[PDB]
Every structure is written in structure tokens, then in C-alpha cells.
Amino acid sequence: QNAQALNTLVKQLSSNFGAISSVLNDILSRLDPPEAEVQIDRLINGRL
């Protein structure tokens, strides 16, 4: 049970949650601040 919980927590890190991509660096290096803020907000909400 402990191992499965940890595995689920690790695997959840690769979800888009509606954003363009699940990689922070790509969003940082592909978008302007005004939209990147929204994308990062969405991603951090999901991870939280």
C-alpha cells in the first residue's frame, strides 16, 4: 500500500491538467509571461 501510494504520487507529475505541456521548462521557453502565468497556475493547482 505504501509503495502504491508513492507510485501514484510520482506518476501524477506528468499530467497536463489542461495546460499545453507537462514540462515547466518548455512552457517557460515557449510562451510570453501573460499566458505562462495561467498555464503555471493550472499546473500547480493540479499538483497541489
Binding site: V10, K11, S14, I20, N25, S29, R30
Partner: protein, 270 residues
């Protein structure tokens, strides 16, 4: 543990890209019959494209300008065409218009730089050689050539305003595929650094960690490996077919051992 250096590793390519072959092209294929020029096995400074003469629109949709240097792509597609001044805005992801829905539509997730500049001194007459579609019942698929009469000729005239003025537009379509990259740009491939927390940037594979010798039995077409958690663990160098392990820079928690402050103020750190 903070990064200590900055490593750079790009394949054994030094020849300049034929960027001027399509950027300085005498004739540009019509927007409805646009050509797709594939550039590979070359290195070129994208700053010269950023700051070329008479350039008015150099925007990277899905890329950051001046960041293309540290990013190498397997193939770069150069789409050369001429449209109106008001039609340059339509060459972008998520944009709608005559060109964006009749002749040349970029994908909504476009990863590339759209380059345009005024060409009223070259493509003005009405210049009845450039043509754009004006009618269609639906929207074009991304990167598709579609060939009242829908195909209406351009009324490109020197007396026409900047909106109607002819503009040469070049689209650089970057494909970041798992195959080794060749369109690398101005990057001096640094020495392979071992046992140091360094930023990888292996042909633009952004990351950081410790690089050591690797013993994996890679297949010839495979460029990088992965772990059970879908985490990159090994990368093959583009120049020499050697794979290197990746270990993230060490970290942890810090705790302080202290007695009562009423006794003394000597502390120990773990």
C-alpha cells in the same frame, strides 16, 4: 547542490545552413502552393534571421527568440511564400483569416518562428503571379496545399498600402524528434564533464545532473533511455556514439542540534 558549470554537446557539424537560400530567395512559392524546404546537417546563427535588414515581423510562436541557439532540431522546414501585409498576422497558431483558412494554416500548437518582411520593392507590379485562395467551405488542415473562382490573384501594387503591400514570409518548422538533431546553430560543443552537477543541454535536452560513463546496450537507432518512472537516465552523445548515465545533483534536509539556550549557544548541524 547548485550547478557548477555549463556543458554543451552538439554533433560534428560546422557548415553554414542554406538560410539565405530561402530567406534571400529570388522567387517565393505562392501561399496556396507553398514549398517546404528542409534544412539539415548544418549550423547557423538565428540572430542573423532575427536582425536581418528590412525585417519587420520576427516572432517565434512556440519558441523563444535567441533561445534557438542552444536548441538543435533534427529537421527544420522552411516554408517560403508571399502574402499581404495584413495577412502576416494570419500566419500564427490559433489565427483565423483569408490566408489562415484558405491557403496556409499553421497548427494550433505551432512550434516555430514566423519571419516576414516587406517586399514592395520586389513583388509589386498588380503582381499577377502570386495567388491566394479566397473561398472554401471549411478550414484547411495544418500544412496543406489546396489547389466566384476561389483562387483569386493577388492585387500586389506599389501604390497599395502596407496592408495590401507584398510581404515575403518564411516559416521555420522545427521538429524536435527523438532521432539525433542536426540543425544546431552556433554552439561550441564543450568538453564532456564527469562527476559534476552541470546543465545538460544535450542538443537542447534541457536538464541538470551528474554525467558518468554508461553500460547500457543501446540499439543503434535509439538516442536516449528512460526509467520505469518515465525519467530520463541515459543520453547518447550526438558526436560519438557513447551513452552517459544521468544522476541528479544531491540534496537533502538540514537539522540543527541545540541544547537549552539557558545553558549555552553551541550548536551542531546534521
Amino acid at each position: 547542490v547548485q550547478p557548477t558549470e555549463s556543458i554543451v554537446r552538439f554533433p560534428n557539424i560546422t557548415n553554414l545552413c542554406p538560410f539565405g537560400e530561402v530567406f534571400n530567395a529570388t522567387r517565393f512559392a505562392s501561399v496556396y502552393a507553398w514549398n517546404r524546404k528542409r534544412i539539415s546537417n548544418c549550423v547557423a546563427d538565428y540572430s542573423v534571421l532575427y536582425n536581418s535588414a528590412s525585417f519587420s515581423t520576427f516572432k517565434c510562436y512556440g519558441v523563444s527568440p535567441t533561445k534557438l541557439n542552444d536548441l538543435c532540431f533534427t529537421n527544420v522546414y522552411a516554408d517560403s511564400f508571399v502574402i499581404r501585409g495584413d495577412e502576416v498576422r494570419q500566419i500564427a497558431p490559433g489565427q483565423t483569416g483569408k490566408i489562415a483558412d484558405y491557403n496556409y494554416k499553421l497548427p494550433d500548437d505551432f512550434t516555430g518562428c514566423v519571419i516576414a518582411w516587406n517586399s514592395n520593392n520586389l513583388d509589386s507590379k498588380g503582381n499577377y503571379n502570386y495567388l491566394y485562395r479566397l473561398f472554401r467551405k471549411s478550414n484547411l488542415k495544418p500544412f496543406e496545399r489546396d489547389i466566384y473562382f476561389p483562387l483569386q490573384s493577388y492585387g500586389f501594387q506599389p501604390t497599395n498600402g502596407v496592408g495590401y503591400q507584398p510581404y515575403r514570409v518564411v516559416v521555420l518548422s522545427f521538429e524536435l524528434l527523438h532521432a539525433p538533431a542536426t540543425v544546431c546553430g552556433p554552439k561550441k560543443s564543450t568538453n564532456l564533464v564527469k562527476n559534476k552537477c552541470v546543465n545538460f543541454n544535450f542538443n537542447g535536452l534541457t536538464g541538470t545532473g551528474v554525467l558518468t560513463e554508461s553500460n547500457k546496450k543501446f540499439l543503434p537507432f535509439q538516442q536516449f533511455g528512460r526509467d520505469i518512472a518515465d525519467t530520463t537516465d541515459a543520453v547518447r552523445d550526438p558526436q560519438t556514439l557513447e551513452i552517459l548515465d544521468i544522476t541528479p545533483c544531491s540534496f537533502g534536509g538540514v537539522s540543527v542540534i541545540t541544547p537549552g539556550t539557558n545553558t549555552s549557544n553551541q550548536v551542531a548541524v546534521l
